[PDB]
Design a protein around this ligand. Sequence first.
Ligand code: HEM
Ligand code: NAG
Ligand code: NAG
Ligand code: NAG
Ligand code: NAG
Ligand code: NAG
Ligand code: VOH
Ligand code: CL
Ligand code: MG
Length: 326
Amino acid sequence: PGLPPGPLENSSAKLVNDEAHPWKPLRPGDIRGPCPGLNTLASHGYLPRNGVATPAQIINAVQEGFNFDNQAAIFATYAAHLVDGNLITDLLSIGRKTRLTGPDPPPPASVGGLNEHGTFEGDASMTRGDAFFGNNHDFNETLFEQLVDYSNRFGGGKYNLTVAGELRFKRIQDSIATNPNFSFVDFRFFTAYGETTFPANLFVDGRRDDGQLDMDAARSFFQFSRMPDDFFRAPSPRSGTGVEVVVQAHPMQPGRNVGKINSYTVDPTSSDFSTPCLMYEKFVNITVKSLYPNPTVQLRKALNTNLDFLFQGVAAGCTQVFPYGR
Ligand code: HEM
Ligand SMILES: *[C@@H]1O[C@H](CO)[C@@H](O)[C@H](O)[C@H]1NC(C)=O
Ligand SMILES: *[C@@H]1O[C@H](CO)[C@@H](O)[C@H](O)[C@H]1NC(C)=O
Ligand SMILES: *[C@@H]1O[C@H](CO)[C@@H](O)[C@H](O)[C@H]1NC(C)=O
Ligand SMILES: *[C@@H]1O[C@H](CO)[C@@H](O)[C@H](O)[C@H]1NC(C)=O
Ligand SMILES: *[C@@H]1O[C@H](CO)[C@@H](O)[C@H](O)[C@H]1NC(C)=O
Ligand SMILES: COc1ccc(CO)cc1OC
Ligand SMILES: [Cl-]
Ligand SMILES: [Mg+2]
């Protein structure tokens, strides 16, 4: 594995929909998944256009194309790679499972790409349906139209953090009401909130950076993986700033439905926003370790390297944990 890239040398706003990075349609075999950011980077050639990439390629692409901040890029990328990528070949699919990531490790590891439900991807996404309903990765028009409606109602026709706060809660309540397997704990509990800020922070043209995303731009990213014509990236590195507004709108406890609709039951063993270090510790000790309980020599080495890289993205104050020793 390569070292995690460092922050941008020059993080100014600039044209990112440029001559070197044109949008192109999908070819047969090209993979897109549940993340409109990575999808857009692949469809503009910031990532390989087939949607299979190394962690270093992903980190460079999110920084260069969108000004995603370095710490956030490192944590997300290595978390995804650990649970969804091939640690020997150093390749991760941004969507469905593919033979392009190379020879698989033994069960119970899945190397399922970002489409793998319950590892990184989870329920109550804004524009993708819950995995229980049959498709956790494709753009959903009905859900996008709901995003438009919430933008009309709470954002004057634009998507902003106020809209995010209301839509985040709506999606949770809809999953509680209809998905008997709804899960909203630990890693998904965190990412579900942060992801709702990303359209306001990163899909807004960086010459404005006003947190007000228009619906034409929103559809372009969410549906077509396409930057608006003349799109400038954000003017400074960021990811989840303003997530507090989203949480404050409708504070929730982590929990799950318990095999029936309308049975949301709080999980006191889950991390929440009061215990961010616990979220990291459980991700490593439980989630990663369960996929690789007794790895062979070359896998153990790759796990430890990628776990070291993951820890670079963890907020200062947390203690590193070592599931396979040092
Ligand atoms: C840094 C590497 C990144 C990885 C590995 C990644 C991966 C993912 C995954 C797997 C999801 C699905 C979560 C869910 O179940 O809803 C997701 C959600 C999302 N990501 Fe990313 N992401 C990354 C960075 C970014 C960036 C830079 C952007 C924007 C520039 C972005 C925008 C989004 C949005 C908007 C969603 C929610 C989509 C929806 O709910 O419809 N992500 N990401
Ligand atoms: C950084 O990039 C911007 C936009 O491309 C440019 O205007 C600026 O002068 C660059 N800064 C340095 C120090 O080169
Ligand atoms: C149902 O929930 C469990 C974990 O609570 C998860 O392993 C499983 O993949 C879920 N499946 C769907 C389709 O939601
Ligand atoms: C999209 O989401 C809606 C609302 O949850 C759902 O009823 C529909 O089956 C989903 N799929 C498609 C292909 O529209
Ligand atoms: C969202 O837009 C609405 C209408 O313009 C406005 O009242 C609200 O303050 C905005 N919220 C943010 C966080 O910009
Ligand atoms: C994770 O495992 C380490 C031992 O490697 C231990 O110190 C730590 O308390 C564990 N944390 C959790 C949340 O299980
Ligand atoms: C910055 O942390 C994240 C990076 C990527 C995703 C998925 O788009 C979720 C994150 O946590 C909010
Ligand atoms: Cl940064
Ligand atoms: Mg999802």
